[PDB]
Amino acid sequence: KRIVVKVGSHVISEENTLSFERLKNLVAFLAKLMEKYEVILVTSAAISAGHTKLDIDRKNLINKQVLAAIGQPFLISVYNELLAKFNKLGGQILLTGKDFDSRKATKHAKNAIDMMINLGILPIINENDATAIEEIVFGDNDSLSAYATHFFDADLLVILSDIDGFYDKNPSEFSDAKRLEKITHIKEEWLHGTGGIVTKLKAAKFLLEHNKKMFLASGFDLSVAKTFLLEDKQIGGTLFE
Amino acid sequence: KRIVVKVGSHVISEENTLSFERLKNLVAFLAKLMEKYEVILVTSAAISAGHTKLDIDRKNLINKQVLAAIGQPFLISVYNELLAKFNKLGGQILLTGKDFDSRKATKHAKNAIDMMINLGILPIINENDATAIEEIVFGDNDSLSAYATHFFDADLLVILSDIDGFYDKNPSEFSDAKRLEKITHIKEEWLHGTGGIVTKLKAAKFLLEHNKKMFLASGFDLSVAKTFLLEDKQIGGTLFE
Ligand SMILES: Nc1ncnc2c1ncn2[C@@H]1O[C@H](COP(=O)(O)OP(=O)(O)O)[C@@H](O)[C@H]1O
Ligand SMILES: Nc1ncnc2c1ncn2[C@@H]1O[C@H](COP(=O)(O)OP(=O)(O)O)[C@@H](O)[C@H]1O
């Protein structure tokens, strides 16, 4: 069983810094996951990381690309210092949605990833923000992680988010919103920023169409994600299957 | 006036370590060039950098991709530590030859690069070894650096190398080999590893055909390159124009 874990920007960053508390917790979780599964990490937050090195505004798209260029290698260095605690290494992979249309590009990427996994190295994927901007504009890697799950032959995508699950209505607006534990179909009526719930549901529709699964849970408190993946009991979050 | 400096793996590597000395020398040189020019760096040695962290056999191709994934971000952090001496930052760009065929990918890349240069950030380009292997197999970024030069609107590509220039015959094999100081045409008759002189000549042919220039010079002794670029005077190397 191979899983893809996707962590959004908010999960690993505050507005002016990286969240070392949350990164530490995530990395300890990934180290444990790696004993039980083959694990691929899809990370965001290169822009946050770059912003710690260069204080320019994030609204302009081209500014975001520059910040990502500066931030990406530093973000990887942070993951590597934290992984060192568990005697693990992380390898950087940059991909775009268009790479996934290419048999050749996908095959080369899968070769590297498969071998990393074989050596117990953690593959860490992010968008190539030099050549593509889709995930910077809208989605924050939700789609990229879904494509990775299918094309690298993983069984499950786990999205760790500031959203703890999918509800019958917006849970931040409506205190009576009820959590949907299981979704087997994504309604078209359900479908610029991080992407919100819509990019999460679009990723799920892609995965459902390729007979794969998605689990949506909190990256702020890892209890639900931990119990699902390590205790095989669902006590929160939404499973799409 | 904009230039690409390409540094090969030999020039910044030793047998089982990075050449920190020659990197330091390179960065000091780049810091002075930035006073006079818009500068783009194309670097190799992600594989050497990775072998420093992971002891697997460098001769296998998929191993090289893995070593590059680990090494690339570490290599960038070493550039950054050296650039901090001049209060400079580097930003990572990963490209492939195939990216250069797409107008959209190249455009997104140039947008980021142009802005980095405006802001004073050094763009540091390498091949994306997840999705392409061409330069790993044969050429060591000669061709990628030629494409970068043309498509990001630089006037001159400087290749820094083992060899101090292009010669009328192989200077390793012949004591009377004469160095050709200026070259106006690439004879088709002149046309796996780092590539030898031929990938350098293919690069020059590409650039002459696009009304651009190339300077082949030593990366071990920077005097010829420094004098050529900072003192507009050729005392060595080969100029292609
Ligand atoms: N039906 C719904 N179920 C869950 N969350 C929803 C729903 N409708 C709206 N939201 C809201 O979407 C918001 C944006 O999510 P977002 O911040 O993009 O997640 P991430 O940062 O992990 O991408 C959340 O604050 C959430 O409250
Ligand atoms: N006509 C020539 N001019 C210069 N070098 C040549 C020529 N023919 C063969 N060579 C060989 O090719 C080498 C340059 O290629 P390479 O070792 O790949 O350089 P780099 O260190 O830049 O990767 C030279 O050191 C030389 O031994």
From Swiss-Prot, chains A, B:
Gene3D superfamilies in alphabetical order: Acetylglutamate kinase-like (3.40.1160.10)
Residues where substrate binds: 44, 129, 141
Keyword Lipid biosynthesis attached: no
Keyword list, A-Z: Amino-acid biosynthesis, ATP-binding, Cytoplasm, Kinase, Nucleotide-binding, Proline biosynthesis, Transferase
CDD domains to which the protein is assigned, alphabetical: AAK_G5K_ProB (cd04242)
Pfam families the UniProt entry points to: AA_kinase
Protein name as annotated: Glutamate 5-kinase
Assigned EC number: 2.7.2.11
Residues that, per the record, bind ATP: 6, 161-162, 167-172, 194-200
Localization, UniProt: Cytoplasm
Enzyme kind, highest EC tier: transferase
